[PDB]
């Protein structure tokens, strides 16, 4: 359940490889519209390391599923985060996310 | 108040019907509080009543009051038609239609910012 | 159940002068076209997302403001029922997007030209960009006022507008069927560039305030239109003589002489000699013309009757010299009104017949077929002065005017009075 | 249904530059200055 929808296009080529960090400018969202998070307003090019499992499931699923500099809608199911009980007291129980990320720099 | 014989319910009776600056025109009644349709589509006895997800309401047009002059239903809160004027073809509606690059179509999508029937189409 | 809070962008809306719609009576076109090439977007100035959406708005309902409204905020347009957005890859309409299919879709990003084609016989509203088509179209919304063009922006964008070839230069061709929209100016304004709906106009001293603007409506396009007595039978001719002769002496004072054709490059009037002199498809329309102004004289609520013959018949003819008799030298004589002096009742009254009468032969060009460009296209159906009168420039507006003031004071020269 | 309420004016407005460039580029338009605000929602009713 990881869907991708383009919303600018990047290099193409560029992909990121394991073992290697990512810089996302992101941003989310819930089904019923409510932003329950950004980056931009913390000012923070939020980084982390693919393949470790920092991240849930469906994000890092759709973080390799870019290029460098594109940008992207994610779709992350029920099931691939936050499944039965959500996290506590922000995202409620089988909760639909959706996404806005932007591959910065570093493949 | 909801008796035995009748519903929880609240009604609206003009003050000044008689003589003396007698005010009339068409008011909007809309309720305070929504009702939600889900987020993803379907696609008493004890057990068909703990499952049903059907609901209802219940006006009535009291004697003395046209039913030709009454519109009964549903509006989503972009509404503000603000007018003394309205016949049900004074309602927005917008039709929208999608399809392949074929031509043909894919789907017909009709939003309306009122759903709404004529009291004056049954009597 | 609480509530929520967050910061959100600013949009505006801006629009050209261009207001089309269609009614029953129409003098419009209804199946236009315009163009629109995006340069410079910033995708992410703000923490929120650059909003910049394209599309065609009506003029009574959409009213965006600078803050709140409908939806979570920063409502511009396709944000109700008024309007109808797209933005690269979604169908804004009734505040909701709608998922497009677009070949290589995307945001409009710069070196972008997006096009709107426009229906207003079957309600349709398409578009292009860069040439290539979407696929998805709007349908049976209401026709209850005027379009015209929007383009609600956030902060952070830059876009030129393309009008047509006199103002922009068209990137693309349009579909077959699709006027270039500079054409439906309307005689008494230039085009002009504005928000909507505003209060708020910097001025010299400090920020003025406005009040409500002042719409034209829907019908304002349609223009507008019995017995006859037998003491105005006999002076409808004679008005009608009186006026050919009018008309040559008018020919004659710019050097249209009485020739077999009729050639205006070579100056040349068949019905410069006398009125009987004129051919009788022009003698009978010098009584058609006649009858035409005298009905509807009676019809708007002015009284006639008929007094003093023998003054009218004591006053002779306007005097002309050598230099007021053409080529042919049969000066024509008409009656002499510089005795006669119009009142204010009259010089209200002389309005009234030139407004009806342009706009009852517009009412038959209408029924002709034909429709209003700024542009002057007699094939195409397109005559710069099919408006109603209040709507027509001054100068046609006192052309019919001076016109018609000709035959008031030569019928008050012919004795009969006015009521008003 | 009433017909008019109070509202309040901002405090500042996009600074709009309109001007027609060329008898062939067009008309244009722009605006680099952002402006933003606070918003309440009353979720009830999506009327911020």
């Given at each position: 359940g990881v869907e991708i929808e383009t919303i600018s296009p990047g290099d193409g080529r560029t992909f990121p490889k394991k073992g290697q960090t990512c810089v996302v400018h992101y941003t989310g969202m819930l089904q019923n519209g409510?932003?329950?998070?950004?980056?931009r307003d913390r000012n923070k090019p939020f980084k982390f390391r693919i393949g470790?499992?920092?991240?849930?499931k469906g994000f890092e699923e759709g973080a390799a599923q870019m290029s460098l500099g594109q940008r992207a809608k994610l779709t992350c199911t029920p099931d691939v985060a936050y499944?039965?009980?959500?996290?506590?007291?922000?995202i409620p129980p089988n909760a639909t996310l959706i996404f806005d990320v932007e591959l910065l720099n570093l493949e | 108040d909801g008796t035995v014989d009748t519903p929880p319910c609240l009604r609206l009776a003009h003050?000044?019907?008689?003589?003396?600056?007698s005010l009339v025109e068409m008011l909007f009644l809309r309720l305070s509080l929504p009702v939600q349709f889900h987020q993803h589509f379907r696609c008493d006895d004890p057990e068909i009543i703990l499952n049903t997800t059907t609901y209802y309401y219940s006006v009535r047009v009291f004697a003395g009051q046209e039913p030709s002059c009454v519109w009964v239903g549903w509006v989503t809160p972009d509404y503000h038609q603000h007018d003394?004027?309205?016949?049900?073809?004074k309602v927005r509606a917008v039709t929208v239609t999608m399809g392949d690059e074929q031509g043909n179509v894919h789907s017909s999508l009709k939003c309306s910012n009122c759903y709404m029937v004529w009291g004056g189409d049954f009597v | 159940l609480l509530l929520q809070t967050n910061l959100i962008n600013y949009v505006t809306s801006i629009r050209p002068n261009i207001f089309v719609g269609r009614a029953?009576?129409?003098?419009?076109?209804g199946k236009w076209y315009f163009e629109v090439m995006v340069d410079?977007?910033?995708?992410?100035?703000?923490?929120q997302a650059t909003h910049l959406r394209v599309g065609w708005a009506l003029t009574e309902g959409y009213s965006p403001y600078?803050?709140?409204?409908?939806?979570?905020?920063?409502?511009?347009?396709?944000?109700?029922?008024?309007s109808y957005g797209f933005d690269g890859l979604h169908l804004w309409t009734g505040h909701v997007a709608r998922p497009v299919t677009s070949p290589?879709?995307?945001?409009?990003?710069?070196?972008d030209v997006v096009s709107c084609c426009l229906d207003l016989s079957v309600p349709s509203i398409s578009f292009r960009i860069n040439g290539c088509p979407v696929q998805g179209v709007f349908e049976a919304?209401?026709?209850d006022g005027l379009f015209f063009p929007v383009v609600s922006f956030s902060a952070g964008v830059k876009v030129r507008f393309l009008?047509?070839?006199?103002h922009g230069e068209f990137k693309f061709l349009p579909p077959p069927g699709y006027a270039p929209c500079?054409?439906?100016?309307?005689?008494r304004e230039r085009l002009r560039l504005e928000p909507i709906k505003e209060y708020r106009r910097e001025g010299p001293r400090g920020p003025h305030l406005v009040g409500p603007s002042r719409c034209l409506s829907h019908t304002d396009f349609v223009p507008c239109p019995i017995v006859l007595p037998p003491h105005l039978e006999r002076i409808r001719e004679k008005l009608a003589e009186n006026i050919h002769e009018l008309w040559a002496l008018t020919r004659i004072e710019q050097g249209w002489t009485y020739g077999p054709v009729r050639d205006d490059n070579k100056r040349?009037?068949?019905?410069?000699?006398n009125f009987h002199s004129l051919p009788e498809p022009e003698r009978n329309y010098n009584l058609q013309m006649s009858g035409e102004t005298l009905k509807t004289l009676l019809a708007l609520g002015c009284h006639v009757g008929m007094a003093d013959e023998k003054a009218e018949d004591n006053l002779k003819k306007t005097k002309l010299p050598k230099t007021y008799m053409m080529s042919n030298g049969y000066k024509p004589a008409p009656l002499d009104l510089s005795h006669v002096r119009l009142t204010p009742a009259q010089t209200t009254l002389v309005d009234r017949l030139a407004e009806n009468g342009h706009n009852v032969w517009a009412r038959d060009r209408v029924a002709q077929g034909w429709s209003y460009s700024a542009v002057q296209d007699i094939p195409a159906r397109?005559?710069?002065?099919?408006?109603?009168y209040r709507l027509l420039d001054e100068a046609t507006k006192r052309s019919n005017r001076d016109s018609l003031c000709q035959a008031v004071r030569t019928l008050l020269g012919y004795g009969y009075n006015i009521e008003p | 249904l009433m017909p008019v309420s109070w509202s309040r004016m901002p405090n500042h407005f996009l600074q709009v530059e309109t001007r027609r460039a060329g008898e062939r580029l067009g008309w244009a338009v722009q605006c680099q200055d952002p402006l933003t605000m606070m918003a309440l929602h009353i979720p009830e009713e999506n009327r911020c």
């Open positions: 409510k932003k329950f998070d950004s980056s470790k499992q920092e991240v849930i499944g039965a009980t959500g996290h506590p007291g922000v | 003050r000044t019907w008689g003589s003396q600056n003394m004027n309205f016949d049900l073809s | 029953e009576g129409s003098t419009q076109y410079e977007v910033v995708p992410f100035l703000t923490a600078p803050g709140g409204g409908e939806g979570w905020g920063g409502n511009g347009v396709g944000d109700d029922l008024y290589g879709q995307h945001l409009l990003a710069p070196e919304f209401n026709l009008l047509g070839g006199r500079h054409e439906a100016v309307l005689p040349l009037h068949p019905c410069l000699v397109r005559n710069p002065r099919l408006v109603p | -």
